[PDB]
């Protein structure tokens, strides 16, 4: 994830590789990401179970 001319790249073997966004993250205030995926919605609660 780039912060200067922000972009989404993927890396493999020290090389760029194609990906695509389907549930792209809520990049917000400073040095942090937010995810609108369904699993992050219950991520803490399923950690609450164990």
């Amino acid at each position: 994830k780039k912060v200067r001319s922000e972009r989404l790249e993927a890396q493999l073997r020290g090389k760029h590789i194609r990906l695509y966004v389907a549930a792209e993250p809520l990049a917000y205030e400073r040095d942090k990401l937010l995810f609108t995926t369904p699993v992050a919605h219950l991520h803490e609660e399923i950690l609450r179970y164990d």
Binding site: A22, E24, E29, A40, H41, L42, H43, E44, E45
Partner: protein, 195 residues
């Protein structure tokens, strides 16, 4: 001078939309309208209602005669023709169904970004003050739209000789939707603020 977005209230106001601190069993009630690909099913009806309304009788009446005289010879004026017409209705509807299907499934999913709408419905239910972005359109930005409308004909010609003429007739709306829909965005920027 009143700051609205990056204050102490509105940050936790958005972290609570996902499962950061509190989650009950009905936080997914927002999710059933957070989804995209309903706007696609809305703009599909919003264009297809216009798509079958720019055609007169004279263009399609000639199709009757061409098809009628291409192969069959009428046997019974009141029986063979009535039955033939009856099947002929669904056989033109299904072929122009798949024709406009091939004409639309290609152009929606190439051009419509998915989560430019979910970020919208994560803003309008949340703040009501949704920012929006634009882009200066280089010829390279409009080139692929000008070629992919030329690639829309090949997916319609093989199933219909008229649906080509219909897209050729209704090319104006497709160029109107392909210049504004992907031109606007909603900013998920790190350093943004409403004033």
């Amino acid at each position: 001078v009143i700051d609205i977005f990056p204050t102490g209230q509105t940050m936790s106001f958005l972290r609570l939309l996902h499962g950061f601190l509190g989650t009950c069993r009905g936080q997914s009630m927002h999710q059933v309208l957070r989804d995209p690909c309903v706007l696609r099913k809305q703009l599909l009806y919003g264009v297809c209602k216009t798509l079958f309304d720019t055609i007169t009788v004279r263009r399609v009446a000639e199709e009757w005669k061409l098809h009628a005289a291409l192969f069959p010879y009428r046997a019974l004026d009141e029986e063979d023709l009535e039955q033939y017409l009856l099947v002929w209705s669904a056989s033109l509807r299904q072929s122009v169904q798949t024709g406009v299907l091939g004409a639309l499934r290609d152009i929606l999913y190439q051009y419509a970004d998915n989560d430019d709408y979910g970020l919208y419905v994560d803003w309008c239910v949340t703040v009501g003050l949704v920012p929006l972005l634009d882009v200066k359109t280089k010829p390279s930005e409009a080139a692929e739209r000008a070629q992919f409308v030329r690639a829309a004909v090949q997916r319609a010609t093989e199933t219909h000789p008229l649906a080509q003429d219909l897209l050729q007739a209704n090319l104006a709306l497709l160029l109107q939707v392909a210049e504004r829909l992907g031109a606007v965005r909603v900013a998920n920027a790190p350093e943004v603020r409403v004033f």
